Amino acid sequence: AVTGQVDVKLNISTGCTVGGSQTEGNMNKFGTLNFGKTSGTWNNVLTAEVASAATGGNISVTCDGTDPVDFTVAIDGGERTDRTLKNTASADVVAYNVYRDAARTNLYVVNQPQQFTTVSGQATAVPIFGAIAPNTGTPKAQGDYKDTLLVTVNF
Amino acid sequence: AVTGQVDVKLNISTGCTVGGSQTEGNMNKFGTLNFGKTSGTWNNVLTAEVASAATGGNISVTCDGTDPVDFTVAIDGGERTDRTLKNTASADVVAYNVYRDAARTNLYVVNQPQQFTTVSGQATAVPIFGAIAPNTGTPKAQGDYKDTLLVTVNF
Amino acid sequence: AVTGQVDVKLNISTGCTVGGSQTEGNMNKFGTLNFGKTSGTWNNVLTAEVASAATGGNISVTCDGTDPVDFTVAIDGGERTDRTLKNTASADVVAYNVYRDAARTNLYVVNQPQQFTTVSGQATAVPIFGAIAPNTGTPKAQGDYKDTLLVTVNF
Amino acid sequence: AVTGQVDVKLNISTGCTVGGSQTEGNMNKFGTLNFGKTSGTWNNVLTAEVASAATGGNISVTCDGTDPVDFTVAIDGGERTDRTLKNTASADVVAYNVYRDAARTNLYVVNQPQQFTTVSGQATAVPIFGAIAPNTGTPKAQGDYKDTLLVTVNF
User: Fold this and answer.
1) Cβ of A61 under 8 Å from any chain B Cβ?
2) Does A12 touch chain B (CB under 8 A)?
3) Edge-to-edge strand ranges of the sheet holding D69-75
4) Which helix H or strand E contains A78, and what residues bound it?
5) Which candidate, C93, C89, C29, places its Cα nearest to that of B69?
6) How many whole angstroms separate alpha carbon B5 and alpha carbon D125?
7) 3-state SS string over D71-87?
8) Interface test with C, best of B64, B66, B67, B124 (most C CBs within 10 A)
9) Are C91 and B120 in contact (CB under 8 A)?
10) Backbone phi, then psi, for D125, in 5-degree steps?
C-alpha cells in the first residue's frame, strides 16, 4: 500500500484560449490532417494542411488581454510515438511529419514548444503542415491509415 | 473509557515499488497536475498531465519481482471529496476529474482500483490525465486554485 | 561477394550413442541441473546432480560394438561463456561450476574432453555434478536463475 | 559428435539452510559417524551417532522463514552403494546402516526422502544414528575401515 499525494493547480487570472476546436466528449478535437486518397506507391510527397474541426480552416488561437502574449505550441509523436499512421486492420505503418512553415522546413519537433506570438484583438493561426515522404519501395496494403496527434498549446 | 485494539501488519516478502515520488516529510509526494494559467471564463477544456515530483515526467511504477505482477491504482476525491479545486483565499471551487487514457474516457473513479500490469525488468508509467470542463457561465474569482489528490498504489 | 566452401562429412561405420536425452525440436535435451530453491544469501554450497530429461536419472551413454570404446565428454561455459546463471528478468548473475566426481574435485574444464570408458553390453553414466559457491556477501534478487550448458559427447 | 543441452536452474526466493557443516573444498562436510575401535569379532552391535564437523554435536538444520517448512532428508548407499565400510589397504568390507530414531528402527532407506519438520525461529537436529550388526563369524583384517555417505537435504 503506497499512498501518495498529487498537487492539483490552476491559476485563474489572465489566460490564452485556442479557437477552431470542438469538444469531443472531454477532449478538445483540434482538427484533421487529411492527406487524401493515394495508391500503394506514390512518387510525389503527399502533403495536406490541418483543417480545424470547428470551422474547417486553420486553428485560430487568440489570447485574452491587452499586451502581446508569447504562447508556445507543442505536438507529440502520435499514438505510437514515432509519427506513423497505422492501417485500421493490418499492421502496416506510414511514416509522416508535421511542419510549421509552408516550405516543409521548420519541423514541429516531438514534444517541443515551437514559439508563437499573439496580439490583442486578433487571432493568430497555427499552421500544422503535414508532409509524407515519397514511398517508391513497397506498396502498403489497401485501406485507411490513421493517427491521432495530440497538439499541446501551453504557456 | 472505551479502550480497543488495532492490529498492525506488514508482509515483508516480495513487493512492488512506486518511482517518481519524493518524500515530503512522511508523505510520498507523487506529483503535480498543473493546468496552467487561465481566464475567468474558458471555452476550451483545460487539460494537463501529472508531472512526477522526482523526475518531472510520468510516475514510473516498477515491481521488485521477475514474474509479471498485477498492481492496482486508486485515486481519491481530493480534499473536499468531490474533485474541486479551491481558491486559496475565497470559497470559489473549480470542478475537475482525472482520467487514465489520453482521450479523457477511462475515468479514475473515486476510490476505485483501476487495474495495471507490470512486467520483467521494466517500469510502467501511471498516466494521470487531468481534465476540466469548459466554464462558460460564471467567471471564478482571480487567484490560485488548489487540491491535493491522494493517489493510492495498492496491491 | 565472398563465396566459400564448407565440406560436410559423416562416417557411418560403428559409432557410440548417448541415452537419457529427449529430442527438443532439433536439439538433444540432455537433462536438468536443478539446485532447487534458495534464499538471497546461502552459507552452504548449493549442490545438485544432473537429471536426464528422458528417464530422470543420470545420462547413460552406451556404445554400439564389441570392443571397449574410449569416448570423451566436454561441457561448454553456458550461455554467457563464464558459467553464470542469469535471472530471467533482472541482470543478476549466479556463478556455478560442473564437476565430474562426487567430491566436487575433478572439474569439467570449459571446452575440454574429460575422458571416459565404455564396454560392450553396458551403459556408462555421465555424472555431471553441479556446485555453487557459498554467497555470504550480497543477496541476489528474487526470481528464477537459468543457464543452458551444452554438453558435447564427442569421439 | 552428439552435442546436447543441460538446463541449469536455481530459484532464489525463500529457502532452507543446513547448519553444522564445514565446506571441505567445494563439498559440504556434514560430519562423522565414528563407531570407535573394535576387535576382529564383536558380539555387541557397534553403535555411534553422527558428529557434525562444525560443532561436534548433531547436524542442526534451520529454515530461513517464518511459517513452518517441511524439508526432507535423504542419505545414499555410500561409496560402493551397499553401505559397506572398506579397509583402506585390504578388500575386507564391514556392512552397516544409518537409522533416524534412537532405537535403530526407522531406517534411512537408500535414496529416500525421510520427512522432517522445522518451525519458527528454531534449528531442528538431524539424527543420523549408525548401527553395525554383531559379527561373530569371521574376524575382519586389522586396520581402518571407512565410507563416505552423502547426506542429501532436499526440498
Assistant:
1) no
2) yes
3) D114-118, D69-75, D151-154
4) none
5) C89
6) 39
7) EEEEECCCCCCCCEEEE
8) B66
9) no
10) -90, 145
Task: Write the single-letter amino acid at D153.
Answer: V
What amino acid occupies position A66? T
8 Å CB contact of A26 and B104: yes
Residue with cell 541441473: C33
Asked if B99 lies within 8 A of A21 by C-beta distance, the reply is: no
Q: Do chains A and C touch (3 or more CB pairs under 8 A)?
A: no
C142 and B67 in contact by Cβ < 8 A? Answer: no
- Cell numbers linked to A105: 522546413
Method: cryo-EM
Which chains have 3+ CB pairs within 8 A of D? C
Determine contact, residues D46/D36, Cβ cutoff 8 Å. Answer: yes
B140, A18 contact by CB (below 8 A):
no
Q: What three-state secondary structure class fits B3?
A: coil
Resolution number, Å = 8.9
SS (H, E, C) chain C: CCCCCCCCCCCCCCCEEEECCEEECCEEEEEEEEEEEECCCCCCCECCEEEECCCCCCEEEEECCCCCEEEEEEECCCCCCCCEEEECCCCCEEECEEECCCCCCCECCCCCCEEEEECCCCEEEECCEEEECCCCCCCCCCEEEEEEEEEEEEC
The C-alpha atoms of residue B102 and residue B110 are separated, in whole angstroms, by: 19
Q: Does the CB of C50 have a partner CB in chain D at under 8 Å?
A: yes
Burial of D103 (0-12, 13-18, 19+ CB in 10 A): exposed
Q: Amino acid identity of C78?
A: G
CA of residue D150 relative to chain centroid, distance? 6
Q: What is the 3-state secondary structure (H, E, C) of C23-55?
A: EECCEEEEEEEEEEEECCCCCCCECCEEEECCC
Q: Which three cell numbers stand for residue A12?
A: 485563474
Q: How many residues does chain B have?
A: 155
Residue with cell 477511462: B106
C-alpha cell at B149: 489528490
Residue D121, all three cell numbers: 525461529
Contact status, residue C58 vs residue C144, Cβ threshold 8 Å:
no
Look at the alpha carbons of C57, C63, C69, C74 in this order and tell me if their dihedral is positive or negative.
negative
Separation between Cα atoms, residue C38 and residue B88, nearest integer Å: 56
Q: Which of D7, D32, D27 is nearest to C102 (CA)?
A: D27
